[PDB]
Design a protein around this nucleic acid. Structure first.
Lengths: 215, 227
RNA sequence: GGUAAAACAGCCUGUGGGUUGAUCCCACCCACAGGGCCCAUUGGGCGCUAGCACUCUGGUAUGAAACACGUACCUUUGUGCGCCUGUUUUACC
């Protein structure tokens, strides 16, 4: 039976200088054969801690690991800006090896409302038979945000996709794009295209809209 | 650093197809080490795949790849391999080679990792993107700030790169993670916020490069002529 | 009374009954009833700070080494040897 490594929390928001503790709980004995890694977006993981509590050569002393039975902790005594990253535990007591699901440590900051922009499909795209309508939520915090598409005041569902940037290195905000996809024939059936945005920094939802074909 | 691992052999493969990945070591000899493969699906966590032990050649596999993948190592070529058969969409991932370090120095920790190589398992065919403008408007402003961009639609496989004004424009640029569409093709947007007063005099060009299809597109993004 | 040798019983604790001696009376047996500790558990084992050898089960440390190989160990299973107590014998004093 494969050894499970249950890692918690899945995400942490902390201010620079805060202490954070990340926990990984094994489902069977793994002795002390537990390693911790740091990974930044687009980069390979880096070893931090081996054998549950030993600091890997060259790793700063603010990182530490501890074992209590089958529960393992990684502690960062005082976060520095370069420490915001994803962290993974790993058991290598027996095969098959198991990584924990990861903890993403992100920077806490004050609330910032998104700036919202809506883009009609280009005339060029329309000639080919598809309409992509794009809604941009720029530089907001925290990450949690709700985008709703309305077409002549009818709520859309299932025909949009969104994605979110990684937290900005300068201002610690997020940005989000949502794309609504329609056929050209369906697009031409309606006039008002609206993106309605709910966010903690907005006392009431903001709607940006355009009339199909207006300047 | 002198110690390096370099994965190669990734790319597109059809469901049910085969690929062999290579892991070339430099600055150390793999014959004194265990070598491991670890993979990461887009936006997901690390998943251990397979390993091979020194001096015995013993091999170990994750249940998720048992019977389909074979790990091996060539002492003379100082290279490890992952033969992958019967691939499925869910095997799409960046595949890393990793050195398990020396027992006395770092226990069983994996002390060196390659940069990884992307494997995409899909029935879709390679295709360069269509690039459409996201035009600014004066009626669409956040104060004196306007937004514009490029929609990079219907390309396959990952990745694409976007720059603005050939890398001269970096401030305020957000290039979003791609989404996989139901068609099996990817799409992403890249935007930038600029002063509204600049829109008449300042030119904006997004430079889109899709290496898998040898496609490069430069798209000028302008206010609509009526604006 | 003692000495020596080959045996037999002993995880721990009851409750009956038998054995075989007149009664008695322990030892053995039998049944029953429980209560622990361990193991590799449709079940099996446990007299032992008196332990040893080999063998297995599962482990540790180490050699650039999780397995395999070498080295030094621990543990468990089984077997043999040793040991303690109790009882019965045989040789001898």
């Amino acid at each position: 039976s494969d050894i499970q490594m249950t890692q918690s929390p899945s995400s942490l928001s902390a201010s620079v200088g805060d202490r954070v503790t990340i926990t990984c709980r094994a489902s069977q004995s793994v002795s002390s054969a537990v390693a911790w890694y740091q990974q930044k977006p687009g980069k390979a993981p880096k070893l931090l801690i081996y054998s549950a509590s030993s600091l890997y050569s060259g790793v700063p002393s603010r990182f530490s690991g501890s074992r209590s039975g089958t529960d393992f902790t990684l502690t960062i005594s005082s976060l520095q800006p370069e420490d915001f990253a994803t962290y993974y535990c790993q058991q290598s007591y027996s095969f098959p090896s198991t990584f924990g699901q990861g903890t993403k440590v992100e920077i806490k900051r004050t609330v910032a409302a998104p700036s919202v922009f809506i883009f009609p499909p280009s005339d060029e795209q329309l000639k080919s038979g598809t309409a992509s309508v794009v809604c941009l939520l720029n530089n907001f915090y925290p990450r949690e945000a709700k985008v709703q598409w309305k077409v002549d005041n009818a709520l859309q569902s299932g025909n949009s996709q969104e994605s979110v940037t990684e937290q900005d290195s300068k201002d610690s905000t997020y940005s989000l794009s949502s794309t609504l996809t329609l056929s050209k024939a369906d697009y031409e059936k309606h006039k008002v295209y609206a993106c309605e945005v709910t966010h903690q920094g907005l006392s009431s939802p903001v709607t940006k809209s355009f009339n199909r074909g207006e300047c | 650093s002198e110690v390096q691992l370099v994965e190669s052999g990734g790319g597109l493969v059809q469901p049910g197809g085969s690929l062999r990945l290579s892991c070339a070591a430099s600055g150390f000899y793999i014959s004194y080490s265990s070598i491991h493969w670890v993979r990461q699906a887009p936006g997901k966590g690390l998943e251990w795949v397979a390993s091979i032990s020194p001096y015995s050649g013993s091999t170990y596999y994750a249940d998720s790849v048992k019977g389909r993948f074979t790990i091996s190592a060539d002492t003379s070529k100082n290279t490890a391999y992952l033969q992958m058969n019967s691939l499925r969409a869910e095997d799409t991932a960046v595949y890393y080679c990793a050195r398990q370090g020396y027992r006395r120095r770092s226990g069983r920790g994996f002390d060196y990792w390659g940069q990884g190589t992307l494997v995409t398992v899909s029935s879709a065919s390679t295709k360069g993107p269509s690039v459409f403008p996201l035009a600014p408007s004066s009626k669409s402003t956040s104060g004196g700030t306007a937004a514009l961009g490029c929609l990079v639609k219907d390309y396959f496989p990952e990745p694409v790169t976007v720059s603005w004004n050939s890398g001269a424009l970096t401030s305020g640029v957000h290039t979003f993670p791609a989404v996989l569409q139901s068609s099996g093709l990817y799409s992403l947007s890249s935007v930038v916020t600029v002063p509204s007063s600049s829109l008449g005099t300042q030119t904006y060009i997004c430079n889109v490069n899709h290496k898998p299809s040898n496609t490069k597109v430069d798209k000028k993004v302008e206010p609509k002529s009526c604006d």
